[model samples]
Target: IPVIEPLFTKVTEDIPGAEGPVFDKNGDFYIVAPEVEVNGKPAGEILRIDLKTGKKTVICKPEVNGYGGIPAGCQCDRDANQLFVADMRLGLLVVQTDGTFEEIAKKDSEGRRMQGCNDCAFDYEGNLWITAPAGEVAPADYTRSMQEKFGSIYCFTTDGQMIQVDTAFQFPNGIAVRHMNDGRPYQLIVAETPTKKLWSYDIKGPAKIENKKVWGHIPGTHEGGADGMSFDEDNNLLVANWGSSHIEVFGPDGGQPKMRIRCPFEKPSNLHFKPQTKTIFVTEHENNAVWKFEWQRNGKKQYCETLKFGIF
Candidate 1:
């Protein structure tokens, strides 16, 4: 039994339903508060935190189609200084630095309505990948959503095309792209929360995929499953086990997890690396807080960090 005494620190807390911890190129932190209520309704907010000062500012409370966005995840297009948000209520959205937001896609290429988005990530080729855990279901209807398996994965290409990459997941929650050292997009990994499984997809190219397989699984008999995940520089997959209260690390080849990093809370929703460091920022539900822990390996560089101009 090998034990690693990992040191964890709370960056910020008391953020109602905090999830989707991410960072801009400048190193400023961003997270979503999805359970926020405004006039007794869900008014999800995106908050930007200054780690240097421990101060947070509300970036926006996005509203679309007359409904408030229940934001679940967020990522930064570092080169453009734009934040991509996965809104469980409003679909995929992009929030500008000035606090304005826009829905990037309301429907897929086949003209079908897109489901409620949960999380998003960018491949090296600049294609944006997303997970929709609740397919077109209203967030308020928790029971129906939990039992249904209409979850899907979507890819928005660099050339402005929206494609439904996969479907029929119980709850496809977190997504990340595995890339080569030269920044070539390699495989796609997604977490099916209800099943506690991490699914793998062979990435032929941007918006091109095949050969789906079970990459790995998280052990948990509790109600929560695998919520969010990311990769380290060593190609180790680090997953946030929502109910199990720890981040599970799986080797690149994937079978059983190699190690588990314990968390102080019960529901860590998502995690992201702070650019080039071994530091990982996590968002959890229990204390509605954001936490950071130093890992054994450096963090992989995201697509945003590899770019210089906009997606051009």
Candidate 2:
């Protein structure tokens, strides 16, 4: 593995389990802090983190639906003035600048309200793909892991077309598209958490998900592999090993291990790369901290991609 140089670290107390690290068009980023309070919970809905200065602004302390109605993952539209998020209580919601949102995906095509909706990804073709881990439970005891039964993946189109891609994931935590420099992706990949592996599916055909196969495996352990993931400006795949206290970096093509970055937290919930300054931000679940690092991009001063948007 490539020896990654630790450039810097930042810690704060506002966010307890910093999950989602998403970016809007304005060179700003957002993160998920599931539980917070007024004298205790703030707009833990989201925090706008500065890419360069490491300043965090509590933009949206949102409404937590129930016990498990916590927000998990987040994504933004192209040049989004508003941000969209995947929730445990509410299936899909869009957050305004003030941190309030309306439900966009309240149910699947089968009329079943999506429970345990874990993660989501966006395609340039104007579609949002999501994953729901199985093993249903009540809000008071929200269960998020294991695979006694298979969970489902869905493709939600802007035109009101919802397609069930598959139902074979153990615990799909993070989802991303392969970056090709083109406008869209060749395929999409998911982090099968409990299985300690990565899986891919080609979606260029009418089926939407074709040739589904194992992309790679996580090092260290076979269970609780990782939590969140994204691609760097160099197309390097970065995923956090939640139980291992480390982040794994795969080669651009997903063929080799490039680096192993030992993080400063117990569980890294999610991460994003700030393209403008070539910096990486990681959200920690066990502690209220957001870690930052510089990519050392082969110094062109040109950010070819927004690392937070999951590459392609």
Candidate 3:
């Protein structure tokens, strides 16, 4: 079976920047609607959806939202009470389930204000890692940031210090945390969409990022690229191709494509396979929709092993 087919798709209006998607422990997922601009302010809601029931609700409204409120990336922490988000206009913020959030990154180690915060993933040690485009829209040539090398990945230490780790991306969009079976993460896998390449960074030391190297070019990413990424039970990297309607699965070793999950949308922003439901979730930015798919493992692993032990 080793494949995926679409399950349910939900579309919303007035929600422009439907970017980050994360799941709680209970299988419920959160989608950020960065609030499309109205007369001059962001007009959207933070949505929480029940995957099984197909039910949706608004947990919070736009906050100081400008330019779609620019809520770019999101991740669920060990604490259900809070979720982390990357705000272009606000830096890293902690969004509370109670409908509030606090800024986590105010400035870099050099004391400069964070301009554009794209995506974030907290390492196993609780250190926050994010990528910020040097200049996405400065002169149109620098916006996509490909030829400009304006994108940089940063780490916000638990002790409150922001350090620039890597500056080697065209458009560093999505980041995925790779955890060792023993609960320690050895490296982080990130995607540079415009350059159509993936990178693996060593982060198993006492600090956030030690070093990084190119993993490989993502399949079907010749003109296409990738945004958010996720890991399956077997650690296969499922990439939500940035401008395509398909999901490209890179094997556990970052080799060639393993499988492709097709969708009817034009461009997808982010995706994650929720462990609780074993379903893949995606946020389609271009289509103003969120999608879920059920995987039909043709022969990836023993079904019983994945079901009972959560591993293959």
Candidate 4:
């Protein structure tokens, strides 16, 4: 197999608090660097970048004295006209292609406050599926409230209907959806961060839901944080490992990683692949930068036609 090399290590000094990075259909990249907090006050803002020119623009700056939730997960619709951002502090905000922002959905159907809507994915049917990392605190404090609230994955339809899937995840971080081979319907792939485990469930069409299982697990690692995940051309799972600083490539059968791409980031939180150039765009959360790498293929070629960009 061919090893990967960084296409560009360029850093955007203007975007210091970068989190999620996704490319638009036009190839423009967007990211969120939430308000910085100082002495319990908010201080950061959202930033957008033109990949071609590397130009930075401040999208929204909420003045709440405390950062209005770290803008963590984001995804755009099929039309690429509206950008949906999961504000860890303010719930979900919809930003239009014209740069106008608005809060679309804040609470679930039960009205329970969503602590942190971290990452989200859009299904083939135009529905938005989101994962919530409920309760505050890090991994240590996670166990305390895990039994109570824990993390949950919710499904939001295009018509504004919300349905909370089973709530049993430790810290459901990154999520994505795609149609299964059985030709029945789509399945939800959730990356349980703190536990280093991946789960899958079938959302049968717009009516039925069943078959939840632990699809895969990370081995030979001490629960190293697994952040974002994406399916390669061969349907292999490419997961961004924060603690390991590498992206583990797993086969379609959910077997051990077929390859690992060692990244140069302190922490690679999320990643998306651009099919046209066979390039992978990774979000380096800690270092406040985004890196692009080209994947080299050997043996049988795996071609990915549909490339979905993650917006945060």
lDDT of 3 by residue, 1-312 (tens): 145656655534334667787765444678887645568654445678766665667776645423334577877665344777776555567777777766665467887655456788776566778877644311112133556676878887767777877774787888877777765768888888877788988885534576677785665644558888877766777888867677888877885577777777767778766654466667886667777666543212111112222343
lDDT of 1 by residue, 1-312 (tens): 133547888798789988988887777788899889889887889998889766789999888655788899888885588888988877789898789988877678898877888899898777899998766634344321467778888998888777999988888888988987767788999988877788999999988889999999888789988888888988898888998878888888887788888888888888999988889998888888888889988888876687565463
Global lDDT scores for all candidate models? 0.84, 0.67, 0.67, 0.64
Question: On TM-score, who's better, 1 or 3?
Answer: 1
Query: Model 2: per-residue lDDT, tens digit, 1-312?
Result: 765657647834457667777767665678876655445432345677765676778776555463334567877766456776766555566788776666665456777655546677776565777776743423334455474546677777777655667885677778877645765567788888877788888878422888988887777763468678877656677888887777888776674457888776667777776655667777886676787777656211112233435754
**Segments in model 3 whose C-alpha atoms lie over 4 Å from true places:** 1-14, 25-27, 40-45, 50-56, 61-68, 134-147, 221-224, 296-312
Regions of model 4 farther than 4 Å from truth? 1-8, 11-17, 42-44, 62-67, 136-149, 180-185, 219-224, 297-312
Each candidate structure's TM-score, on Cα atoms with residue i matched to residue i, is: 0.94, 0.82, 0.81, 0.81
Residue-level lDDT tens digits of model 4 in 184-213: 246778888767678887888652357988
lDDT measured at residue 263 in model 1 versus the true structure, 0 to 100 = 84
Candidate 4 or 3, higher lDDT? 3
Per-residue error (Å), model 1, residue 139 = 12
lDDT, residue 179, candidate 1: 83
lDDT of 3 at 188: 83
